[PDB]
């Protein structure tokens, strides 16, 4: 029942510790702390494959400015971030590996938090 509105302060307080847990993963979170810059990274085809880019800093901004109205929107952006990376990077690459590790941390952290919000 996702059209029920939550208060931005309450969403921030419950969901931000799960975002901080991702940021704490070093070096696994390093590829995800800023938007993908295809020029910087030498991958000019990135925006051809990844139509809706997402990363930790954008999620964090949306959380800090109250842009999520309900918590699955946050969960959606997190998985969008991980899906983009699993889609774009080769299964044998370091980034793919970091993505799988970071997604594992997120699954652990998010479940009791979402349980306590529903
Ligand atoms: C071509 C491989 O790069 C990527 C390809 C795809 C994606 C995604 C998320 O789909 C990410 C990266 C990526 C990005 C960054 N950091 C920055 O882009 C950045 C840092 C500061 C400013 O920009 C570091 C690394 C990285 C690390 C760590 N150790 O080895 C490598 C390599 C990898």
Curated annotation (Swiss-Prot):
Changing residue 83 to E/R: Abolishes interaction with ASF1A. Residues 6-113 form the Bromo domain. Changing residue 100 to I: Impairs interaction with ASF1A. Coiled coil: none annotated. Residues 83-101 are annotated as: Interaction with ASF1A. Changing residue 47 to A: Impairs binding to acetylated histones. Methylation of the KIX domain by CARM1 blocks association with CREB. This results in the blockade of CREB signaling, and in activation of apoptotic response. Sumoylation negatively regulates transcriptional activity via the recruitment of DAAX. Changing residue 86 to A: Abolishes interaction with ASF1A. It is found in: Cytoplasm; Nucleus. Residues 45-91 are annotated as: Interaction with histone. Found in a complex containing NCOA2; NCOA3; IKKA; IKKB and IKBKG. Probably part of a complex with HIF1A and EP300. Interacts with GATA1; the interaction results in acetylation and enhancement of transcriptional activity of GATA1. Interacts with MAF and ZCCHC12. Interacts with DAXX; the interaction is dependent on CBP sumoylation and results in suppression of the transcriptional activity via recruitment of HDAC2 to DAXX. Interacts with phosphorylated CREB1. Interacts with CITED4 (C-terminal region). Interacts (via the TAZ-type 1 domain) with HIF1A. Acetylates histones, giving a specific tag for transcriptional activation. Mediates acetylation of histone H3 at 'Lys-18' and 'Lys-27' (H3K18ac and H3K27ac, respectively). Also acetylates non-histone proteins, like DDX21, FBL, IRF2, MAFG, NCOA3, POLR1E/PAF53 and FOXO1. Binds specifically to phosphorylated CREB and enhances its transcriptional activity toward cAMP-responsive genes. Acts as a coactivator of ALX1. Acts as a circadian transcriptional coactivator which enhances the activity of the circadian transcriptional activators: NPAS2-BMAL1 and CLOCK-BMAL1 heterodimers. It is linked to Chromosomal aberrations involving CREBBP may be a cause of acute myeloid leukemias. Translocation t(8;16)(p11;p13) with KAT6A; translocation t(11;16)(q23;p13.3) with KMT2A/MLL1; translocation t(10;16)(q22;p13) with KAT6B. KAT6A-CREBBP may induce leukemia by inhibiting RUNX1-mediated transcription. Rubinstein-Taybi syndrome 1: A disorder characterized by craniofacial abnormalities, postnatal growth deficiency, broad thumbs, broad big toes, intellectual disability and a propensity for development of malignancies. The KIX domain mediates binding to HIV-1 Tat. This is CREB-binding protein. It comes from Homo sapiens. The chain holds residues 1081 to 1197 of 2442 of the full protein.
């Amino acid at each position: 029942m996702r059209k029920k509105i939550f208060k931005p302060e309450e969403l921030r307080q419950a969901l931000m510790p799960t975002l901080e847990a991702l940021y704490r993963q070093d070096p696994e979170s390093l590829p995800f702390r800023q938007p993908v810059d295809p020029q910087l990274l030498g991958i000019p085809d990135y925006f051809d494959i990844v139509k809706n880019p997402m990363d930790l800093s954008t999620i964090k901004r949306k959380l800090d400015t109250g842009q999520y109205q309900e918590p699955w929107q946050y969960v959606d952006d997190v998985w969008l971030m991980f899906n983009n990376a699993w889609l774009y990077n080769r299964k044998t690459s370091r980034v793919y590996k970091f993505c799988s590790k970071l997604a594992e941390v997120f699954e652990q952290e998010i479940d009791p938090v979402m349980q306590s919000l529903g």
